[PDB]
Design a protein around this ligand. Structure first.
Ligand SMILES: [Cl-]
Ligand SMILES: [Cl-]
Ligand SMILES: [Cl-]
Ligand SMILES: [Cl-]
Ligand SMILES: [Cl-]
Ligand SMILES: [Cl-]
Ligand code: NA
Ligand code: NA
Ligand code: NA
Lengths: 223, 223, 223
């Protein structure tokens, strides 16, 4: 009963953690979760039950927060559009999300990803595509397109110099600032276009639904 | 000849390192060691030859040492039994072990595992089972049951607050103490029951015997 | 056009990064690069385009630099030869290399590898062979034998005490110096002999050639 006050909605940014499918196609269709997915759902259960946050956040994520405004401005000038940070979190019965930029005029979501350094930044188009696949940003965009009724998403990978306050004793000013400022700004944005894929949105639904059932079972053990 | 003063007995806590079997069933039956097993046996050889200890020990293992008495008391009250720390190391021709608790009245070994934090602690029954499998504690218990002539083992995963002296500059008091003290103690013990499995004990024998032959070969190279 | 001032030659020490072959034999023969190889070539492209050095160097590599002379002396006394550090970097159309020791009298390259500690040092012959395979030193030697017209290479893995200036606050004087000085020096050199393999040299050619084409494509995206 207490456990009807616990209910899982998966953040769009965490959907890649639970989206994976069993290698067995019959188990995929039966809605069995992968070991990775279960491990992620346990972290979500332990956060909601105990307040323990597995991923605190660090200099990488703090850089994106500090440069968020600058990223959105670059997204805008690259497209000749006056863009603003979206400030609403939406949700449906499965997921919740707060996108960076919503452009209703083009049925378009834009998301800015502020790379840490030249090494991690995907300058090259194959590199950007893979990074979006490996990091799960493709699935994240499908979640935003679902919540915002959009037809496309564009992930703007952007490299700015690292703000001084985030460069630790062991980090390099030369690498994280000087070398970056030498590169023309137009070469430091790489965009990956993701088309809405309703079969993928249906997959998000199936996987999240299986995750919520597993989550409920976890909650019941602690009740 | 000098090398007849080197002889491998594998600690119960390290048996998981050498227990793995080749994917090839014919090689398993021929007693071939896996690459993992060989790598572990080299560490054992280099410790006995050179005094170099690969695994020093750290805040995680120090927590278990500091809270060992408290763990055993919780193991006892959970069962209505007055339990004491076992203080003998036993050995046979293959392995050596010192269990935490021996209950001859029930042909039972108990082992306490003091989790570091909420994240690493297996609250959930599937989680505890997997942790015992992944960490090799199931095989460790088979080794103690062999040495102590017991029919069952119970692994008590227990979460206590982290002692202040073990919380580094970068660790969280809030997470490692405050959040833990909010959780009822009865929800911070999860027990996994392992039945004695004589086929597994025979596997320990085979694998350790192959390890000892490999070890002897390593010793001979340095002689 | 600017991009005709960018040209990839792979260092012998990095050849293992790009030498891997697709699991598909038809793709291997078509000259397709593995994902690992592509990832390495991107790091090379970003270094030449932006000056960003992915691998800076650390206490492990600094130890080898400091003890380079001592290593070469041990290589020499082990063989009864007066050896000197080779000081030329050679190159051909594919690779560049600077070997440690060239012995034209024996059509022989020697390379010294200064292990960090007892744990990482390959005392055992199987261990040394695997380390040379895992680290890619076998392929590195094929590259030097190609550049220096030699028939064989010998990799001398050598363990000396770690110089004091490289032992960090958290490192052990006892382990990195005292325990090492107790071991006879003749037990702290393990040599692996690599025969010239012209089929492997042809493989280096094919793989580097595919890498250079991929590299050129990366350069063109940034031009
Ligand atoms: Cl989100
Ligand atoms: Cl990044
Ligand atoms: Cl033990
Ligand atoms: Cl733990
Ligand atoms: Cl080189
Ligand atoms: Cl090393
Ligand atoms: Na973003
Ligand atoms: Na224990
Ligand atoms: Na060398």
């Amino acid at each position: 009963g207490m456990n009807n006050l616990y209910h899982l909605k998966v953040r769009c940014s965490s959907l890649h953690k639970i989206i994976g499918e069993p290698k067995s196609k019959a188990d995929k269709e039966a809605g069995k979760l992968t070991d990775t997915a279960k491990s992620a759902v346990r972290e979500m259960a332990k956060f909601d039950l105990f307040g323990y946050n597995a991923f605190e956040g660090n200099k990488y994520t703090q850089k994106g927060n500090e440069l968020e405004e600058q990223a959105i401005k670059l997204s805008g000038v690259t497209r000749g559009l006056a863009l603003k940070k979206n400030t609403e979190r939406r949700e449906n019965e499965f997921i919740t999300g707060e996108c960076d930029i919503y452009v209703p005029s083009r049925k378009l979501i834009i998301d800015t990803k502020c790379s840490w350094d030249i090494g991690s930044h995907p300058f090259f188009t194959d590199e950007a595509q893979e990074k979006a696949k490996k990091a799960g940003y493709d699935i994240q965009m499908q979640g935003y397109m679902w919540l915002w009724d959009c037809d496309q998403a564009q992930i703007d990978f952007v490299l700015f110099p690292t703000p001084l306050n985030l460069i630790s004793a062991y980090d390099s000013d030369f690498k994280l600032i000087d070398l970056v400022e030498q590169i023309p700004q137009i070469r430091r944005i790489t965009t990956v276009i993701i088309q809405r894929d309703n079969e993928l949105i249906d997959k998000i639904k199936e996987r999240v639904s299986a995750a919520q059932k597993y989550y409920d079972q976890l909650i019941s053990e602690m009740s």
